[PDB]
Amino acid sequence: EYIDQGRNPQLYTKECLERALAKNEQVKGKIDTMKKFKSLLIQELSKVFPEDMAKYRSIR
Amino acid sequence: MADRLTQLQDAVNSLADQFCNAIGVLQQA
Amino acid sequence: RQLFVRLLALVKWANDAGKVEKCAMISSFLDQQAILFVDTADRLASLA
């Protein structure tokens, strides 16, 4: 399709680079959200049941 | 009343609301 | 003119033949990761 379009694959390369940058940004955002969720879960555990907090901190 | 069922239902509703809020914030001042 | 365009396309494909395969593999891996993440999020939402 890109060959019949009449252009080179350089535009496809730039689009792939932009998609990779967007995927890296989305992965960073998802990792930040997962870290925030883990922090909130640890806080809820420490405020509710210290047994699970001690297990995750020393036993794991 | 003052029975265990009231507090149980309250805690269940609170847990459900917390789960719904977490699900909403995980796929989104 | 058509032959010149075809030769330019062939040159652009031959100068970046392995790079094209690497970019395609990277794009496929990124798409698979995004699809897996979306599926996990949908499953978590449906379960919760």
Q: Report CB contact under 8 Å: A13, C13.
A: no
Q: Smallest Cβ distance to C27: which of A6, A9, A16? A: A16
Q: Which amino acid is at A40?
A: L
Q: Report CB contact under 8 Å: B27, C48.
A: no
- A56 secondary structure, DSSP code: I
C15 CA to centre of own chain:
18
Dist. CA B1–CA B5, nearest whole Å:
9
How many CA atoms are closer than 13 Å to the CA of B8, on its beta-carbon side?
A: 3
Residue C26 contacts residue A16 (beta carbons within 8 Å)? yes
Dist. CA B16–CA C48, nearest whole Å:
8
What technique was this entry resolved by? cryo-EM
Chain B CA closest to residue A41: B22
Positive or negative, the Cα torsion across B18, B23, B26, B29? negative
Residue A9 contacts residue C20 (beta carbons within 8 Å)? yes
